[PDB]
Amino acid sequence: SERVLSYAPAFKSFLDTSFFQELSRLKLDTCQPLTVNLDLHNIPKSADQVPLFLTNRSFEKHNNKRTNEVPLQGSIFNFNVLDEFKNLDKQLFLHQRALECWEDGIKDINKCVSFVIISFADLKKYRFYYWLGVPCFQRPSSTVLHVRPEPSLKGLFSKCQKWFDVNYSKWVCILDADDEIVNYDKCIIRKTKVLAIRDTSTMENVPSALTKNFLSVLQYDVPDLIDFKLLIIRQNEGSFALNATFASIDPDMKVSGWERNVQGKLAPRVVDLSSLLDPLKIADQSVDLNLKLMKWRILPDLNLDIIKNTKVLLLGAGTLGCYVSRALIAWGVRKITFVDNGTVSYSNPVRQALYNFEDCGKPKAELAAASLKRIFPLMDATGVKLSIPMIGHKLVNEEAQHKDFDRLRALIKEHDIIFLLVDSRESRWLPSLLSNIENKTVINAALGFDSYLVMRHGQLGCYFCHDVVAPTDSLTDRTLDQMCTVTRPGVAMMASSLAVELMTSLLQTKYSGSETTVLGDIPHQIRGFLHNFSILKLETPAYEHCPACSPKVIEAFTDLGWEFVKKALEHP
Amino acid sequence: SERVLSYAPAFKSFLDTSFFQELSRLKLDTCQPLTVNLDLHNIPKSADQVPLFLTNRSFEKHNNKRTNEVPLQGSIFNFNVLDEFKNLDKQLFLHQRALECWEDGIKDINKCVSFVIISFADLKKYRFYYWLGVPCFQRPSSTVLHVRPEPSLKGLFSKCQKWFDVNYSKWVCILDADDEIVNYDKCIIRKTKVLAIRDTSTMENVPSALTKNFLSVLQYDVPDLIDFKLLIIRQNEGSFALNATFASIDPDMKVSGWERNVQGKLAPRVVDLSSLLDPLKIADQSVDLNLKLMKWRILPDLNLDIIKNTKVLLLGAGTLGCYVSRALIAWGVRKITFVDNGTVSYSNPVRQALYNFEDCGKPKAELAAASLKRIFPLMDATGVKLSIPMIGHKLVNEEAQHKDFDRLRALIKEHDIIFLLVDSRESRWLPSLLSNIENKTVINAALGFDSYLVMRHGQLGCYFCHDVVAPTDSLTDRTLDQMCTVTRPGVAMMASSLAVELMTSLLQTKYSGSETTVLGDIPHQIRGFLHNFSILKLETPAYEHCPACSPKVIEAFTDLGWEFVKKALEHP
Numbered sequence A, B: 001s002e003r004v005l006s007y008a009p010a011f012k013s014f015l016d017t018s019f020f021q022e023l024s025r026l027k028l029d030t031c032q033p034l035t036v037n038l039d040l041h042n043i044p045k046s047a048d049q050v051p052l053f054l055t056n057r058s059f060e061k062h063n064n065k066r067t068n069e070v071p072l073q074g075s076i077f078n079f080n081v082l083d084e085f086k087n088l089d090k091q092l093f094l095h096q097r098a099l100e101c102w103e104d105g106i107k108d109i110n111k112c113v114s115f116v117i118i119s120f121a122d123l124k125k126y127r128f129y130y131w132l133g134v135p136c137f138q139r140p141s142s143t144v145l146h147v148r149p150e151p152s153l154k155g156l157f158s159k160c161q162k163w164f165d166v167n168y169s170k171w172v173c174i175l176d177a178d179d180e181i182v183n184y185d186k187c188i189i190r191k192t193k194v195l196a197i198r199d200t201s202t203m204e205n206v207p208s209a210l211t212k213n214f215l216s217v218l219q220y221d222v223p224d225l226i227d228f229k230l231l232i233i234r235q236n237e238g239s240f241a242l243n244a245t246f247a248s249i250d251p252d253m254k255v256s257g258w259e260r261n262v263q264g265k266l267a268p269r270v271v272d273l274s275s276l277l278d279p280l281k282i283a284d285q286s287v288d289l290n291l292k293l294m295k296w297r298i299l300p301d302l303n304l305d306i307i308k309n310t311k312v313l314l315l316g317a318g319t320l321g322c323y324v325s326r327a328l329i330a331w332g333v334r335k336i337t338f339v340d341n342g343t344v345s346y347s348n349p350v351r352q353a354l355y356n357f358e359d360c361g362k363p364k365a366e367l368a369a370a371s372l373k374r375i376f377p378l379m380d381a382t383g384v385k386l387s388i389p390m391i392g393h394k395l396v397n398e399e400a401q402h403k404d405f406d407r408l409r410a411l412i413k414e415h416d417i418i419f420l421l422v423d424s425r426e427s428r429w430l431p432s433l434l435s436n437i438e439n440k441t442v443i444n445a446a447l448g449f450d451s452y453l454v455m456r457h458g459q460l461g462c463y464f465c466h467d468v469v470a471p472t473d474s475l476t477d478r479t480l481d482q483m484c485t486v487t488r489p490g491v492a493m494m495a496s497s498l499a500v501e502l503m504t505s506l507l508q509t510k511y512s513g514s515e516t517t518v519l520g521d522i523p524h525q526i527r528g529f530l531h532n533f534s535i536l537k538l539e540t541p542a543y544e545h546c547p548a549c550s551p552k553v554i555e556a557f558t559d560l561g562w563e564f565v566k567k568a569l570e571h572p
């Protein structure tokens, strides 16, 4: 019938986000008093111990217990150096606590219960390292306790239950000579022989480890008392009566109490609250949902990931470059590389939607990238100050220009879609070929005072296959891609959006037996005119003698390379 | 034949922009030594005196005269308080200088010549106040000088001309007993009786006022010499010989020398160099030229002033509001007022092209205006946090909402074009009527996942005359102006540009007997579809029973006002 009384952890930590917020608020503005209000009635049939709830107020003085709650004093030790936290004598620490409890207990048996929390806060990463500890001392370490059940005394139990509900600051109670529940008193128990403990465990026939504390104080007070009655009082039906006797096996005080982590080991717990408190992360969240939500309610078949993971290289950080990067960004695109040789001029901000008056004279390409990062910090924006050599132009400083030719490839290579947003025909050649030799989709945007042209490179013709504008054409029409950057402002806005929206329809899977996708058509060329508010979709076939995508041309570059590129550039 | 020798100002100031730049560079990083190199050979037949050129180096130690140039020492007195400059004893100041020259002259007759500059610099306004002074002392003030011509001695003159070209630090020379040009020497002149002066004037028969200085030193040295020969040597052909005699009329020293200003009076000169050195002004300049230049080479008949002076009120500072304000700005528009009640949310920057991650949670409308001012400081951008009440909605807090109704009028009134850039049909009503009751052009922009609608209010129908979308319509089509703000990003960009470009074609004079202008058509409604990349221009007539522009409706508001507006809002 007999057995050795075994125990169960006294509490279970539940640290709320608010707790960690207060902890931070305090670290920016090394021991801290904490108070919690326990509720030994509200206990889930699923838990093993009274839950210890910690929030932004456990830090406060005035907490407001509810009828029947048990106030429990505690503290938190914060560490600034992560190494110090890690390198702390966990054992000596809990021992230094248990001692404090032992000192209070021998004075008032009802003050040897408490909890402690050691923690290191990584405010920048929003990580939080903590460890809850409940000082549980057993002295002497040799003195164990033999016990044997006693059939229930629902009467006695109900008595103690009420007493503990009322006497909210007491953990122990006993019977007087008239058998009435009263505060623990050494010379009384010494005769009445009954000890009732407010248990914080639900583990069948297994009391809270805090029982050890009280028995240690009991032994100290009544050295001779060796046989008594233990009552483990629980606020429900598990209260049980025990016939106790104090054994001994071989002053030494063993201490335990550290709480087991989520995984189940005796180590610190680490909580990463960045996805909740990082304004940057909360932001990124919404940018995502806008699209997720868009897809979900209107076009569930739309592929967002594809668009998001497309690495876009923009050749030209001017009017087009800014409006284009803008649209891409709202489509989810996270990798954008700006390539522009110029600097921000006085007349640029009002036209090129990425600059300010303050950043004039500064290197343009690198500023566009910085600009995107201000809109969305998570963007992987970059700026390269590189110049694309033009056709029919005497080569200058061939060495540095040769490098420029090499660097332009490394870029057209590490990227998926290539946006050609330059000024004149002359700067579209080198990049258009390289892109072809490297198998990369190319989308061209050209401006004209009145109109614009948007088109893609493959068979489908390219920009140099057939001429776009004829000579026997309108004055305000022949201005297309004619180094005409100043135009009716609306041109660039439209040209840009269509270029980006063409890239996304095009990035979607095509319906078998049709030239459309879930987002619509996928034209070869688009042409808009402002004077009459119109658009045209023309398609042109690869031309055999194109000075750019023609088989002979590709061959040339393939066999000779720079030597050919060079000659091709100077040839007038 | 005789006469009293009259004089002419010794110099003429020419302060170069560089001079004022150095002056500033020094004020940010109270007397200052200046050195100038005169050129008595290079003298325009149009000027009266040797020009005194001051530049960023007159401040320097090592200036480098050219052969024949005459180095002239001088100084500048800078004042920080404009009042002190104004309240300076101009007279006592020049007198305190003349004295310094007199002290040097009695030691070396060739050191009594110099210039001075008093100045107050207004660095923030780029204004510069200065006054050049050439100390010219006449002592005694009573002793004038009677003179009579002597026919030329081209021989003697050439002699002195050469001597002064060589002896660049001397202003005076004389003849020795062997009649050879030598440095002035009291006991020698006292016998030779000839004084040759390096003149800085071109005024026929009228020497530089500096002549007075030398004669004052001459009188001091040779009190008895009363009859001598004066030679005014000029580096050209005006050199003349004079028979001189020292008269007297009633130690007193009169001082003169201050230079006459541009207008012709004896006061300070003020130069405003802002249109040159104000980066803000230099900027505004170019923003202007881009358009000026655009017009000039491509469309000389385009009216820019009209567009520039149009006061635009944008109702809604969201996706549309930002892209719209952007386009207007590139067209020259300087008055833009944003009206939006919301604040910048996390998911806004990547979509609404005027905000940043940093300005989230901040009042949206006021931030849009601040945003424009960063692009172009001269913009007259403003933000009003006002909410437009919606149709079919229980009135809430009627007082504050009544004010909102009044304030919305004061705005629709002080502005010329009204851009209605809201979310749903419900918020287009109140502003659409008020705009009609106040005779203001209204341009509507509505978004739909796939499409958009842009149109203007007059007869021509309005937004509420006939419905835009039908029920028996496409799913992705019925989303138009349906509180659908998240859409394919390209929609807003296009919708916006077309709205702004429609406003400008529309702001131009119409060709008699046609519905076009120099910029093209002027549609009533424009409609774009992204899935197929198309546009449509439809026109609709004012509908007799429109709940907004119908005669009965206008009447109602006209006679009853708020009472009617209120009932109209709640009516479901």
Ligand SMILES: [Zn+2]
Binding pocket: A185, A186, A187, A188
């Ligand atoms: Zn006692």
Ligand SMILES: [Zn+2]
Binding pocket: A461, A462, A463, A464, A465, A466, A542, A543, A546, A547, A548, A549, A550
């Ligand atoms: Zn081709």
Ligand SMILES: [Zn+2]
Binding pocket: B185, B186, B187, B188
């Ligand atoms: Zn002498």
Ligand SMILES: [Zn+2]
Binding pocket: B461, B462, B463, B464, B465, B466, B542, B543, B546, B547, B548, B549, B550
């Ligand atoms: Zn109507």
